[PDB]
Design an enzyme around this catalytic site. Sequence first.
Site, PDB file in Angstrom:
ATOM      1  N   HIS A 140      35.474  -0.168 -23.291  1.00 25.99           N
ATOM      2  CA  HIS A 140      36.593   0.670 -22.879  1.00 25.99           C
ATOM      3  C   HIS A 140      36.308   2.162 -23.039  1.00 25.99           C
ATOM      4  CE1 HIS A 140      38.098   1.681 -26.935  1.00 25.99           C
ATOM      5  NE2 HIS A 140      38.169   0.405 -27.262  1.00 25.99           N
ATOM      6  N   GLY A 190      40.055   6.793 -32.563  1.00 28.39           N
ATOM      7  CA  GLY A 190      38.633   7.076 -32.500  1.00 28.39           C
ATOM      8  C   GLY A 190      37.760   6.236 -33.416  1.00 28.39           C
ATOM      9  N   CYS A 236      37.237   3.164 -32.918  1.00 29.99           N
ATOM     10  CA  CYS A 236      36.653   2.126 -32.078  1.00 29.99           C
ATOM     11  C   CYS A 236      35.139   2.137 -32.177  1.00 29.99           C
ATOM     12  CB  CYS A 236      37.077   2.334 -30.627  1.00 29.99           C
ATOM     13  SG  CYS A 236      38.858   2.532 -30.425  1.00 29.99           S
TER      14      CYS A 236
HETATM   15  C1  LIG Z   1      41.465   1.835 -23.198  1.00 32.78           C
HETATM   16  C2  LIG Z   1      42.211   0.873 -24.114  1.00 32.78           C
HETATM   17  C3  LIG Z   1      41.501  -0.501 -24.212  1.00 32.78           C
HETATM   18  C4  LIG Z   1      43.635   0.684 -23.633  1.00 32.78           C
HETATM   19  C5  LIG Z   1      42.274   1.526 -25.499  1.00 32.78           C
HETATM   20  C6  LIG Z   1      43.098   2.811 -25.633  1.00 32.78           C
HETATM   21  C7  LIG Z   1      43.194   3.508 -26.990  1.00 32.78           C
HETATM   22  C8  LIG Z   1      42.480   2.909 -28.190  1.00 32.78           C
HETATM   23  N1  LIG Z   1      42.616   3.658 -29.447  1.00 32.78           N
HETATM   24  C9  LIG Z   1      41.673   4.742 -29.796  1.00 32.78           C
HETATM   25  O1  LIG Z   1      41.850   5.339 -30.784  1.00 32.78           O
HETATM   26  C10 LIG Z   1      40.459   5.152 -28.928  1.00 32.78           C
HETATM   27  C11 LIG Z   1      40.025   4.599 -27.749  1.00 32.78           C
HETATM   28  N2  LIG Z   1      38.966   5.266 -27.352  1.00 32.78           N
HETATM   29  C12 LIG Z   1      38.716   6.235 -28.257  1.00 32.78           C
HETATM   30  N3  LIG Z   1      39.657   6.148 -29.228  1.00 32.78           N
HETATM   31  C13 LIG Z   1      43.771   3.363 -30.293  1.00 32.78           C
HETATM   32  C14 LIG Z   1      44.513   2.157 -29.741  1.00 32.78           C
HETATM   33  O2  LIG Z   1      44.110   1.039 -29.877  1.00 32.78           O
HETATM   34  N4  LIG Z   1      45.776   2.402 -29.051  1.00 32.78           N
HETATM   35  C15 LIG Z   1      46.516   1.259 -28.519  1.00 32.78           C
HETATM   36  C16 LIG Z   1      47.977   1.691 -28.432  1.00 32.78           C
HETATM   37  C17 LIG Z   1      48.845   0.684 -27.686  1.00 32.78           C
HETATM   38  C18 LIG Z   1      48.248   0.306 -26.333  1.00 32.78           C
HETATM   39  C19 LIG Z   1      46.781  -0.129 -26.412  1.00 32.78           C
HETATM   40  C20 LIG Z   1      45.890   0.841 -27.191  1.00 32.78           C
HETATM   41  C21 LIG Z   1      43.447   3.022 -31.746  1.00 32.78           C
HETATM   42  C22 LIG Z   1      42.329   2.103 -32.098  1.00 32.78           C
HETATM   43  C23 LIG Z   1      42.112   1.787 -33.534  1.00 32.78           C
HETATM   44  C24 LIG Z   1      42.993   2.380 -34.634  1.00 32.78           C
HETATM   45  N5  LIG Z   1      44.109   3.285 -34.251  1.00 32.78           N
HETATM   46  C25 LIG Z   1      44.347   3.611 -32.818  1.00 32.78           C
HETATM   47  C26 LIG Z   1      41.648   1.622 -28.074  1.00 32.78           C
HETATM   48  C27 LIG Z   1      41.550   0.924 -26.702  1.00 32.78           C
END
Ligand SMILES: CC(C)(C)c1ccc(N(C(=O)c2c[nH]cn2)[C@@H](C(=O)NC2CCCCC2)c2cccnc2)cc1
Lengths: 298, 298
Positions: B39, B141, B143
Site C-alpha cells: 500500500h 507511519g 507500517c
Molecule cells: C492505504 C491504506 C491500506 C488504506 C492504508 C492507509 C493509512 C495507514 N496508516 C499509516 O499510518 C500509513 C500508511 N502509509 C504510511 N503510513 C494508518 C492506518 O492504518 N489508518 C487506517 C484508518 C482507517 C482506514 C484504514 C487505514 C496507521 C497504521 C498503523 C498505526 N496507526 C495508523 C495504513 C494503510
Amino acid sequence: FRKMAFPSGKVESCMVQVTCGTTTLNGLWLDDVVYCPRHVICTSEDMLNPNYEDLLIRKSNHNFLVQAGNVQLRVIGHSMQNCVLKLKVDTANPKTPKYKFVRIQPGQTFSVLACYNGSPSGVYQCAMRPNFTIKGSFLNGSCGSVGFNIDYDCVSFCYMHHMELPTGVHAGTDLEGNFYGPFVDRQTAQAAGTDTTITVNVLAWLYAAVINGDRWFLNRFTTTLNDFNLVAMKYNYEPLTQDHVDILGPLSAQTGIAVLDMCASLKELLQNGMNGRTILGSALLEDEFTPFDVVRQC
Amino acid sequence: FRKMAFPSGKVESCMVQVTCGTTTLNGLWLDDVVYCPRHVICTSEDMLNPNYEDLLIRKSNHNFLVQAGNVQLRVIGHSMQNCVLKLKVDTANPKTPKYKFVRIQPGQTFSVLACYNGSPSGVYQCAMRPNFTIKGSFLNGSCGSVGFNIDYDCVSFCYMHHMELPTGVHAGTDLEGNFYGPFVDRQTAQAAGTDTTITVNVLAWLYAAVINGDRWFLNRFTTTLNDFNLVAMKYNYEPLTQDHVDILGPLSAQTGIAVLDMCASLKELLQNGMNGRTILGSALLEDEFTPFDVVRQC
Ligand SMILES: CC(C)(C)c1ccc(N(C(=O)c2c[nH]cn2)[C@@H](C(=O)NC2CCCCC2)c2cccnc2)cc1
Ligand SMILES: CC(C)(C)c1ccc(N(C(=O)c2c[nH]cn2)[C@@H](C(=O)NC2CCCCC2)c2cccnc2)cc1
C-alpha cells in the site's frame, strides 16, 4: 500503550563474557576496557566477608578470561573502581557507541539487556524503585547485564546488575561502581526496604490513558498539593513536589486536565478503587512510565 | 517476571525507509531485496478501492526511493507477492542475519521493533490474538515494522505491520504478504471480530507463577477437559484442546501439578477473582506468555 524498551543493538555489540576461575558473568566492553562486577573475583569460600583489595592484589592479568562471542580478548591490565572491576584489554571495541556513564534517581526508567555467558538474551523496560531496587527478570549468571537509555545515538549507561535480594528484586551499581541503595556485594541477610509507589509516574500514566481512550476516572474536582500529599502518605505513595507538577506541564496542556485536577482523580482511585473498571488494560495503577516515556510513546 | 522481548540488533540493521510519491513507510532489507507493504503505492484517493496490479504496472524503478540510514539504495527491479512489495536493490545488506520467514498461529508471541522513517523507535513483546489482530503500539507511519523471534541465532520474521483497525488494534501479514485474518489493505469499514482469552497461555503463566514460588490459587479439585471448556467459554476463553494439554506437559512435570488440576485452579480464579492479591505482579490473568516463553524465561 505498552511497556517499550529502547532498541538494544548498540549495547548488544558491547557484551562480553568474563571468567575468573570457576565463575562466569557478563562484562561491558567499551573502547579498550571491560567493566564487570568486582564480585567476579569472590570465591564460594570468600562470599561471606571478601577482602576485595586483597583478592585483587592476589590476581594477575592472566587470571581473567574475556571472550567477545568466539574471539578471546587478552587482558593487559586490571583495576577496581568501587564495586566495578575494570579489565584493560589489548583491542578497542570497534563497535563502541557514543556513550556516557550516568547515575539515575528513583522513579527513572531504563532498558535492561539481560545477558548470560556474554550473550544477550532479552530486553525489557525497568524503573529504579524508591527503595533503590529493580524489579527485574534475572537468573543466575545475569550479573554484569546493564541498564541504559538512548538519546539520539548516545547510549547513557545507568545500571550494572550485581545481585538478587531475598524478595526476588535486584540490586546493582552505576557504571562507576557505586551501589544504588543500602546494599553490599557480599553474602548477607540484606533486604529491600519497604517500597512506595512513584506518584509522578502514576499521574503520567493516567495522562497516557486520557490521551488514548480512557476517561472514566476524570471528575469535576481539583485538590491542593498539601491535601493530596496527605492522601499520598496514607497510601504509601511518594510525595508530589512542585517540580513534578512542572514536569507534567506538557501533558496537562495537551489534555484539559491540570495536574491537581488529575490528583483529584487519583485521590478517588486510591480509596474507592477502580470499581471493577480498567485503565489502559490494567487493574492496578502503573508506576513504571515516566512523563518523558509517555511523550516518547504516544 | 517480565514480558521480555528479543534483543533487536539483528533486525535494526535491516530497517530501511521506502518512499513512493508522498508516502513514506518502513521496509525490511534482507540480502538484495527490500520487503514492504504494497500500500506504499496507494495514492491519497486510491485508498478505498485500489487496483494494485494496475498501480504497480505504472511504476518504474526510479519511483521508489529506498534509504538505509544516510545511504540511498538504487532499486533495480520490483515485484508484488500477495500484499507485500519486493524491491530489488543494487546492494545486498552486508548485515543480513541468518533468517527465515514463518507464518504463526493465534496465541503465538513475538517481539515487535516499532520503526518510523526507517529508524527503530522501541521494542516490545506482542501476541497474535485469536481474532488475528495484534494489540500493538503503532502510530502513523509505523507500517512495515516487523515482528520476529530469535531462538538460537536465527531470526524468524512472522509479522509485517500494515494497518490500524477501528478498535485501535492492528492487522498485518506474514513476510509472504498473506494477511493474518480476513482483513484487506484497503480503506474499508472492516472491524476485528470478537476476541477471546488465550487459555493455553494463561495456564502457562499460572505454571510460571508456581515455578516462581506462588501457590495460593491452587485448590484440591480436578476437572474433565469438557467441563473445563464449558465453564471457561462462559468467560470468553478460547477452548483448550488436547494439543494444548500435550504442550503443557513439560511444565506439568516440572511443577508436579497435573494439567487438568491447573485447569481447576483457573476455573476457581475466574469464579472468585484475585481477592486483592496479584500473580507475578498482575491483578489480571495474563495471556500473552506461551508455554515456550515460560520455559525460556524461567
Ligand atoms: C492505504 C491504506 C491500506 C488504506 C492504508 C492507509 C493509512 C495507514 N496508516 C499509516 O499510518 C500509513 C500508511 N502509509 C504510511 N503510513 C494508518 C492506518 O492504518 N489508518 C487506517 C484508518 C482507517 C482506514 C484504514 C487505514 C496507521 C497504521 C498503523 C498505526 N496507526 C495508523 C495504513 C494503510
Ligand atoms: C559474590 C556475591 C556478591 C555473594 C554474589 C553471589 C551470587 C550472585 N548470583 C549469581 O547468579 C552469580 C553469577 N555469577 C556470580 N554470581 C545470584 C545472587 O545474587 N545470589 C544472592 C543470594 C544470596 C545472597 C547473596 C547472593 C543471582 C541470582 C538471580 C539474579 N541475579 C544474581 C551475585 C553476587
